[PDB]
Amino acid sequence: AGSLTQLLATGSMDAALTQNATRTFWKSSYQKHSLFALESINQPFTTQVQFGAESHITVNRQGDLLSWMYLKIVLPGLKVQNQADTVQPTQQSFASLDNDVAAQADVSHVLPYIEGAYTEASLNTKEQLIAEAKNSYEAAKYNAAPLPVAAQMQSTEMPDFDYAYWTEAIGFHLIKRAEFKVGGATIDTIWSELLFAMEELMGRAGRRLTETIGRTLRRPTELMKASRQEQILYVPLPWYFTKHPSLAFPLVAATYHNIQLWVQWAQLNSCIIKSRSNLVVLHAERNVPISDDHLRASLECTYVHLEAAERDALTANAGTQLIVQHQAHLQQVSSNNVTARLNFNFPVLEFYYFLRRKANKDAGDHFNFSGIGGRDPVVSAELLFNNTARVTQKPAVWWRAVQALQFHSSAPLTNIYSYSFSLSPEDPITPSGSANFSRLDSVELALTLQDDFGAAHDANSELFVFARSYNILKFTNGLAGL
Amino acid sequence: AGSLTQLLATGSMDAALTQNATRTFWKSSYQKHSLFALESINQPFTTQVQFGAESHITVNRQGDLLSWMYLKIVLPGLKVQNQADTVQPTQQSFASLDNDVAAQADVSHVLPYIEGAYTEASLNTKEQLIAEAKNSYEAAKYNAAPLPVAAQMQSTEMPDFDYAYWTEAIGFHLIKRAEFKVGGATIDTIWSELLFAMEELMGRAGRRLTETIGRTLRRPTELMKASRQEQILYVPLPWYFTKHPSLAFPLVAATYHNIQLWVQWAQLNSCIIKSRSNLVVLHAERNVPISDDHLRASLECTYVHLEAAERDALTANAGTQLIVQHQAHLQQVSSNNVTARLNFNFPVLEFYYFLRRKANKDAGDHFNFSGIGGRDPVVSAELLFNNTARVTQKPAVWWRAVQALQFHSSAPLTNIYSYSFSLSPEDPITPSGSANFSRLDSVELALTLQDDFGAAHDANSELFVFARSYNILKFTNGLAGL
Amino acid sequence: AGSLTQLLATGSMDAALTQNATRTFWKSSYQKHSLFALESINQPFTTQVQFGAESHITVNRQGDLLSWMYLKIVLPGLKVQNQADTVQPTQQSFASLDNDVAAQADVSHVLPYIEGAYTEASLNTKEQLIAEAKNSYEAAKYNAAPLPVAAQMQSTEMPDFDYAYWTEAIGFHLIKRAEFKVGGATIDTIWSELLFAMEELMGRAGRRLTETIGRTLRRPTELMKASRQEQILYVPLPWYFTKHPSLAFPLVAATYHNIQLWVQWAQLNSCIIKSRSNLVVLHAERNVPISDDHLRASLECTYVHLEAAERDALTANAGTQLIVQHQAHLQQVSSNNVTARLNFNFPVLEFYYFLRRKANKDAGDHFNFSGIGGRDPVVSAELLFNNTARVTQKPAVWWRAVQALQFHSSAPLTNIYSYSFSLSPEDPITPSGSANFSRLDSVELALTLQDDFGAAHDANSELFVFARSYNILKFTNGLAGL
């Protein structure tokens, strides 16, 4: 009686929701699709792959569309030997944990707050004086309550043996820059720092790229274990056509253009960290000093094979694809107040920004975007259009956590900040908002950074700003162009 | 030959799926949208913000729609001083870890199972006797196999120094109640306990509110670290209009109504936990005793600016929005059998329920919904409509884990139970089932709780029941009303 | 001036995106739906439930559709007693940690690399010699750099007391096979190993089945704690009709067919692990030796009640549902080169494969798909259609991590490999690609495994291959059939 009465208890308001219902929950409807197949094919670079060099590949035409694209990287296992035991000790310098430049830079900021005879003190007494000076510095700069000295003395249990390892997220760090080219024109460009920021914000829970890029979430002991043997990494290249099947790049519609991936590789000296400064780093299998020619890479592409009728239709009329392109503003930081002039073009969906200390970069911690003592490097930021506040001054947590909560699949674990003009900037096919920067005379991101950011040992810290913008790729008569 | 043969190998069954295909995977189609912009604007309260008080804000009209809404809370850093060293030691009482009322309440239930001279025993001997009595209690009540005494002696390594900290998820706890008002009518009401339950069930992986609300997942050492300095929290207010862009509140259509947020704040005594009972809690920067006027809050609103044509269309005909409203049944618990009479109205989508021990509340652990010794407080529950079983007796795990698995984005880490009448209760725009409680003469939730729940030291434990219900908000001639 | 200028700054390209816009972000539209209700009902098996037996249930007709289906399993708490203290010590043998067959099998592979007097060595000296021999084995087989001996000596802190526990993910392990039958015909079959693989790949972040199936992520101390008391598990049965509301099984349309669930239960000897070989395992409450009749299970079904008009429409014309069926190829492995001949039928969406060592199975670690020493058991795999490479030789990481990244909600934590022909194999209602195996004369999965896989103590290791295939379920005149 009650359940039937609920179906009868309808009024004029229910008519807007349920009158002439076009859907039922109790019967499945499905759509028929055209026939297609997927094939993954690995392809060698056209030029030699080496650390610090640029290499390119011309993408083969082994199907009708191009869908997924992965850079397959093979890194050798690492071993170490004392320089005294080596017949040829001359190698490039690597970052070493016995010379922690990041910890030395952090100590340099607290030196003015050390009370007593620091120079003559025992090692254990120096560690105590540094922890007390950190409390005095943080009280003076941040009105922070002092932490117990014992809580600041975190011994990272480092192993009592010699090692070397590939840096955190080495699969991204290796790709300093990649360019997707069609007919000799650059269609899009991605950077190591952008790839990491995109994975932090858009990386879905349970599908994080951890193993696929050599990322351990800053657990040095896991990087050491992984680096003792050969590593095979599959780094996704997040081009517009890899984001949705309807955006797959129509190879058949671009028949008269070569499709190329260009990759600028990281220098070998930046890719490795060692336990001690006096160690030589060896290729674990070959027992020779590690060299720039030990980098191996290939391109793994997923091709789509279409039925003849769909292939012929796509060849006759591929039309236009909405694309997202990436733009970069890279700036050196030498002061706590920084203004970035964002000379980006087109309808910008969103931008990302973050800072890297010089000391973190020099320590080989390339994706450590933290400030001094691991703090947030940004105090506040403001966004100006033509000297008018588009976003008034907001604290770092608003740009990092509130923007990520509103617009992104994930909140960043590092100090990555974002701002979206789009309601759904991760939707590759549905435009949901933008600001046209080609119609603004000035776009300025004004930053107030933490105290002493870009001073002394951190002179030439880096500001990264990346923007995502809409453009249109047009296919006509076997040619493709922006 | 094989791939072409697959495209030809079609029969009468494939016609239902692929005949006259209206979609292709090999060409992107996109829709054009109207022009809009988003602006985030921070606004002060119209009344003073203080602990234990009620404050309100009249929301400004700085755009055409209202989308996201965050309560921006600023909490001072905490320090502690001995009461003997303080010129004015008189402060409100705070929960203290040297007087663990929750642990004392748990010990009170096992006192009848202590064999031997408990009163005269050494401290280490008392801890052994309590762990043995816990085994005897759990064997007698639950037929549990005894745990090794050493496995029950979990020392939480508490630091050997003085501290105070803001309670777990302080950003939610501060909001005892918030009311969204339009034209003086309450459109919706949210509670601290509901906000926490909603984040447990609907909080997406990689987008949990942890930092934004001061939540550490019960790691006291992280709450201590965070509480030594100023904290800025961004607490999302999950109103119907914040859930989807098409539900954004049409400011232009409600021109003759004031829009107000009212917030009832938590008492300061409930917000802080200290290491010892004899400590005074100080504002870390000001070096004065912490007081009710040290709470600071503002409202951060995201406005939408529309193109004139869409703004004019929305002003002429905003029509009706489907809304979700929240209802609450709050009850004291003094017996292991509890019947809650759910006097909720309208088409209910779902309800949540959970229990809080008096001892957990008094210990300042406001979101600890566990039973005695951290067990599940519910043994079983039944749902009755007009004295007829709508859901027959089911064990706690069915209401907690099976209902969350079927209908929610996440399973709760705490003892939160749910039941959905909707197939998709997290979809804000598509009704997918409900029960109309305004047409039921009685709705009863019958609970069998764990033994001794609501007895002795837990007299006046709390039952929370929250329901989500459909209603319609109508916009007409510059006015808005339910 | 700028925001209005952006709305005016439109060209011929914007017309494809925004001309005649059929959607606005500033007004919600909702659809009305038909009236329905959900009811969860628990039902006993029609036959006795026992370990190692087959049991069936005839599903009741308590609503119009069948939606969710959970196997509710109740396992007793475990206790242990010395065999010498037991009046009837005769019980089935259980795996024991004092006889670690998996560790003994791993040691057997490194015996040829032990230098010195192993047989006469002290226990601590034998552990050192085994760790050194592991380095020599791994250097010889994999060109691995040696790990420090201290880093290989992981003591799992096992408790110094007697225990027994239910094996990891016992809720899946108990279900050796389940069959969904309609009118005496098997519509679909699921296996324990498939259920685990499906949860690894398709299990969403924050909705993993951990507690619901007794899974701890290989933390033996948590399995021990859980196994001391009665456990209630809710194992989801992932049939086609549980995946989407529009696929709910139409009970009213199948009126003349009995609906049955058949379950083949695991043997009791495989379900329990004990600290020592000389222990008897007891039912914790009853204080009797654990026996095959101590398994309890029931079926929890969610019924849908429809409004009379929708019920009558569905009875008159339920038509056809697209279904996914599961197929299995199970093979013994006795060599490092393995070819699996996949005699699967119909349009295959995707397949999963993985290996289990005999030693891992015999140790009771049923979902440990790792190789020797916890390594990846697959070096490479190739997929052939009619002796032509459909997927050329690819390394294990491509089949495990790249395929999961492209097509699945999660990456597997275990050595589960997949390959999809579908762009969205987790979409239950939208076909997005397949390969028709009923039109291929041969489908071969060729595997190169790690060295010594399937040799000596691992003779009769297992290869599992599972495929997901499309079929059609037809409803006509109160009957249902494939």
Added chain:
Amino acid sequence: INQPFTTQVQFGAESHITVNRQGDLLSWMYLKIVLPGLKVQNQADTVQPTQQSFASLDNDVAAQADVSHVLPYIEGAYTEASLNTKEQLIAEAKNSYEA
């Protein structure tokens, strides 16, 4: 006509029987129960002493509960009294309680 259960019959379980159609009407219905004879043995003499707990007359919980209500009416040194003296004091306290 006597008919077996369709499911196993066990203590603490649920069992069902589908009633046969051996005539035109069903009149009387009796549950025929067969219980084994009981014996007892000392737990010390038993090779497997682990059994469910049973109520025992040496631990009369009903008599102990009745004594608990009269404890406030016991005059004198109850704790130190001989068994026969405790029985007297309980009977006197019962009179005082009932008065």
